[PDB]
Amino acid sequence: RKQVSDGVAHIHASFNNTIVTITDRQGNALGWATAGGSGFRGSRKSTPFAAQVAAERCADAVKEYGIKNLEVMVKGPGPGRESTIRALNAAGFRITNITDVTPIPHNGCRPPKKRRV
Amino acid sequence: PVIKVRENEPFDVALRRFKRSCEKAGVLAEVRRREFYEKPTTERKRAKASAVKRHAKKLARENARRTRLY
Amino acid sequence: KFCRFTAEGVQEIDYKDIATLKNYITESGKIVPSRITGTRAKYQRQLARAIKRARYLSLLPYTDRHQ
Amino acid sequence: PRRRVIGQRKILPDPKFGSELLAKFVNILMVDGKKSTAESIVYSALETLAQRSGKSELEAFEVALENVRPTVEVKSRRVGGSTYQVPVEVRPVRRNALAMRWIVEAARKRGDKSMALRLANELSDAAENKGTAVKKREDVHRMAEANKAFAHY
RNA sequence: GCUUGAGUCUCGUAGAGGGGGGUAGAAUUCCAGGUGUAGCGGUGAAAUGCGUAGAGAUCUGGAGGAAUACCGGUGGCGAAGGCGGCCCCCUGGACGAAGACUGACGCUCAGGUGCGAAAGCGUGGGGAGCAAACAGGAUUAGAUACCCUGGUAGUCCACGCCGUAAACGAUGUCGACUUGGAGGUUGUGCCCUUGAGGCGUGGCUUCCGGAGCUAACGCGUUAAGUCGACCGCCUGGGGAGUACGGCCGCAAGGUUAAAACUCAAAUGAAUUGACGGGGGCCCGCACAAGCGGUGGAGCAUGUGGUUUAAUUCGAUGCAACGCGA
RNA sequence: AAGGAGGUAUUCAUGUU
Ligand SMILES: [Mg+2]
Ligand SMILES: [Mg+2]
Ligand SMILES: [Mg+2]
Ligand SMILES: [Mg+2]
Ligand SMILES: [Mg+2]
Ligand SMILES: [Mg+2]
Ligand SMILES: [Mg+2]
Ligand SMILES: [Mg+2]
Ligand SMILES: [Mg+2]
Ligand SMILES: [Mg+2]
Ligand SMILES: [Mg+2]
Ligand SMILES: [Mg+2]
Ligand SMILES: [Mg+2]
Ligand SMILES: [Mg+2]
Ligand SMILES: [Mg+2]
Ligand SMILES: [Mg+2]
Ligand SMILES: [Mg+2]
Ligand SMILES: [Mg+2]
Ligand SMILES: [Mg+2]
Ligand SMILES: [Mg+2]
Ligand SMILES: [Mg+2]
Ligand SMILES: [Mg+2]
Ligand SMILES: [Mg+2]
């Protein structure tokens, strides 16, 4: 309701699922959307198209706030990782910053064991 | 890989620039290699094998570049 | 090629010299490989030590997602 | 063919109209090599369609054909182990052939009595964009849009 | 007696060599709070599991443990095992230059002593992540597994014990001699450094290759070449690195180490095929794009089966079944 | 993921960006 005209789009794109969250510049979240909510399940929810429709759904959700400017923070090794950005541009926000925020450790915790499939 | 849209810069150009920056950084390769724990033996073996492969083909090219193809 | 340090006969990197370190680091903050830069191995090791010491003293950022 | 790049066979133009497109339409309509019967059917249908829907047979035929032509179809690629239904743009000669084939089969299905009457009715209906042929075209377009997600495989 | 082997001193060089103590940032986890709402998580596909007591996501603060991205390199160091953020303290070895010095003080080594990855054991701490055992969900004919969600010992620290690895270069240590080439790394001398250069002279290190050697594969100045000194080990395959005895160990077990019996082979390298749910290339109505069929109906015809006194005999994956006929 | 070029890969003024 409190119009701010500038948001931050956090795109957490894992291999399985993509979560897009629009928030204020300070950190308070406004709206979110996911491929699971978009209806795709499993092999279809791990596709760029699902990420695009989730981004569109999130943009519609936060439409009430009337945000115009939008800085993008993309995180995680996700299948789409880009379709969300294209969807936001299509939805009609001025993309200000495109930033990668993937958390890379400096040889920290040990990862899980390799899968034998 | 921070990217800020330049003045009078098209969005498609900016997006391609961002992909180029990510490629140069090598983010996807790093996270993918860090997805699972590679044993030190496996890592050393893989590195040594790659070096041997690279060196072998260098010698092969530098030698077989003095032959009659036809 | 063209190892810059051996051209001037530099003895030590002198980590306080930020501008040279800025040339020898990437935008993301990590160290550019000697294979790309053209530096000799001995100067490369000295350069790595200097950059790490500068990072500790906060003259250079560890990464661009720090501050 | 694994190794052959010869193109398409040269086809002669329609005697009474000088249209290669119409000649191909007659060939598609023809069954059991009885070209005389198929040619009589199409000529009668074209005359009836011209009188009903417009001025000339070629104009009515082309407008109907354009209303049936498909922009994009779908094929079954197999790259990731499973089969992906991927859309693909159809070359113009295939557009004409698919349109004519759909019109002919739709006309055959129809419940009217004479074949020429069925052909004229279907052609007029396709021109008006309510026919079974245009429904088939809209169906293939609809499925292509549904599976458009795989457009880069 | 001598100075060539060996060693000492003078000046420097590079190194993840070792021990101890601090410190830095990223990241994971947890805790507290704000925003915010119905999914999250996972797979080939799912479920177990987590979330309306508000998860996941996002922001702020805090706690804690472990490990040091980039640099990073068939790069470096160490006798081997092995060693990787940065800083300080203690400390070992190697190499180069010029000389000076001692004057064979050397090499090898059974017993002996010490060091010795990982797992394991004892005592006491610590515990983020990962993870034998275990629990649950799947998969399957079965699945005491591979896959998924959890998860204890352990992984970490201190002090002891253990003493084994494909602990491998499957190549004992020392020394001498024998054609070359391309590199890497670290010294150092000279030539106008004609500016990143040119010519030497050491140490260590990777690849290719000549003679020579080898069963061949290959090794080839870092030898598996030609020789010299000392040590360790083998005597067909299984039985068996097992039994007994001894020694060591808290234990697990380690070390030393047979016999009866049994077979006539077991093996190494390489050669020609075939095959591979190896790789590349190519072709054929092989697929794809199309048209017309068969499989449903009736009848014709052949076969199987059953029946019969006989239902004559043969052909019976493709390549028998309107076949001999 | 597919195709083209260069090399064993860079020197290729900084500036600009
Ligand atoms: Mg997993
Ligand atoms: Mg060494
Ligand atoms: Mg002994
Ligand atoms: Mg241990
Ligand atoms: Mg213990
Ligand atoms: Mg304990
Ligand atoms: Mg498990
Ligand atoms: Mg786990
Ligand atoms: Mg042994
Ligand atoms: Mg080893
Ligand atoms: Mg041995
Ligand atoms: Mg000795
Ligand atoms: Mg050789
Ligand atoms: Mg024993
Ligand atoms: Mg044993
Ligand atoms: Mg015993
Ligand atoms: Mg043919
Ligand atoms: Mg077919
Ligand atoms: Mg039948
Ligand atoms: Mg039969
Ligand atoms: Mg018979
Ligand atoms: Mg018979
Ligand atoms: Mg026949």
Curated annotation (Swiss-Prot), chain A:
The keyword Ribosomal protein applies. PROSITE patterns: RIBOSOMAL_S11. Gene3D superfamilies: Ribosomal protein S11. GO terms for cellular component: cytoplasm; cytosol; cytosolic small ribosomal subunit. The keyword DNA-binding does not apply. It comes from the Bacteria. GO terms for biological process: cytoplasmic translation; translation. Keywords: Methylation, Ribonucleoprotein, Ribosomal protein, RNA-binding, rRNA-binding. GO terms for molecular function: small ribosomal subunit rRNA binding; structural constituent of ribosome. Pfam families: Ribosomal_S11. Located on the platform of the 30S subunit, it bridges several disparate RNA helices of the 16S rRNA. Forms part of the Shine-Dalgarno cleft in the 70S ribosome. PANTHER family: 40S RIBOSOMAL PROTEIN S14/30S RIBOSOMAL PROTEIN S11 (PTHR11759). Has been predicted to contact the N-terminal domain of IF-3 based on footprint studies; exactly how IF-3 interacts with the 30S subunit is controversial. Belongs to the universal ribosomal protein uS11 family. Part of the 30S ribosomal subunit. Interacts with proteins uS7 and bS18. Cross-links to IF-3. In stalled ribosomes contacts ribosome rescue factor SmrB. This is Small ribosomal subunit protein uS11.
From Swiss-Prot, chain B:
InterPro entries: Ribosomal_bS21 (IPR001911), Ribosomal_bS21_CS (IPR018278), Ribosomal_bS21_sf (IPR038380). Coiled coil: none annotated. One of its GO terms (cellular component) is cytosol. Residues 42-70 are annotated as: Disordered. Keywords: Ribonucleoprotein, Ribosomal protein, RNA-binding, rRNA-binding. Residues 59-70 have a biased composition (Basic and acidic residues). One of its GO terms (molecular function) is rRNA binding. Residues 45-58 have a biased composition (Basic residues). GO terms for biological process: cytoplasmic translation; ribosomal small subunit assembly. Transmembrane segments: none annotated. Disulfide bonds: none annotated. Probbly involved in recognition of ribosome rescue factor SmrB in stalled/collided disomes; fusion of protein fragments to its N-terminus decreases ribosome rescue in the presence of SmrB. Part of the 30S ribosomal subunit. In stalled ribosomes contacts ribosome rescue factor SmrB. NCBIfam families: S21p (TIGR00030). PANTHER family: MITOCHONDRIAL 28S RIBOSOMAL PROTEIN S21 (PTHR21109), SMALL RIBOSOMAL SUBUNIT PROTEIN BS21 (PTHR21109:SF22). Belongs to the bacterial ribosomal protein bS21 family. This is Small ribosomal subunit protein bS21. It comes from Escherichia coli (strain K12).
Swiss-Prot record, chain C:
GO terms for biological process: cytoplasmic translation; translation. Keywords: Acetylation, Ribonucleoprotein, Ribosomal protein, RNA-binding, rRNA-binding. The keyword Acetylation applies. It comes from the Bacteria. GO terms for cellular component: cytoplasm; cytosol; cytosolic small ribosomal subunit. It holds the Pfam family Ribosomal_S18. One of its GO terms (molecular function) is structural constituent of ribosome. PANTHER family: 30S RIBOSOMAL PROTEIN S18, SMALL RIBOSOMAL SUBUNIT PROTEIN BS18M. Part of the 30S ribosomal subunit. Forms a tight heterodimer with protein bS6. Belongs to the bacterial ribosomal protein bS18 family. Binds as a heterodimer with protein bS6 to the central domain of the 16S rRNA, where it helps stabilize the platform of the 30S subunit. This is Small ribosomal subunit protein bS18. It comes from Escherichia coli (strain K12).
UniProtKB/Swiss-Prot annotation, chain D:
HAMAP family: Ribosomal_uS7_B. One of its GO terms (cellular component) is cytosolic small ribosomal subunit. Belongs to the universal ribosomal protein uS7 family. GO terms for biological process: cytoplasmic translation; negative regulation of translation; ribosomal small subunit assembly; translation. It comes from the Bacteria. InterPro entries: Ribosomal_uS7 (IPR000235), Ribosomal_uS7_bac/org-type (IPR005717), Ribosomal_uS7_CS (IPR020606), Ribosomal_uS7_dom (IPR023798), Ribosomal_uS7_dom_sf (IPR036823). One of the primary rRNA binding proteins, it binds directly to 16S rRNA where it nucleates assembly of the head domain of the 30S subunit. Is located at the subunit interface close to the decoding center, where it has been shown to contact mRNA. Has been shown to contact tRNA in both the P and E sites; it probably blocks exit of the E site tRNA. Protein S7 is also a translational repressor protein; it regulates the expression of the str operon members to different degrees by binding to its mRNA. The keyword Ribonucleoprotein applies. The lineage of its organism: Bacteria, Pseudomonadati, Pseudomonadota, Gammaproteobacteria, Enterobacterales. The strain K12 sequence is shown. This is Small ribosomal subunit protein uS7. PROSITE patterns: RIBOSOMAL_S7 (PS00052). PANTHER family: RIBOSOMAL PROTEIN S7 (PTHR11205). Part of the 30S ribosomal subunit. Contacts proteins S9 and S11. Cross-links to IF3 and the P and E site tRNAs. One of its GO terms (molecular function) is structural constituent of ribosome.
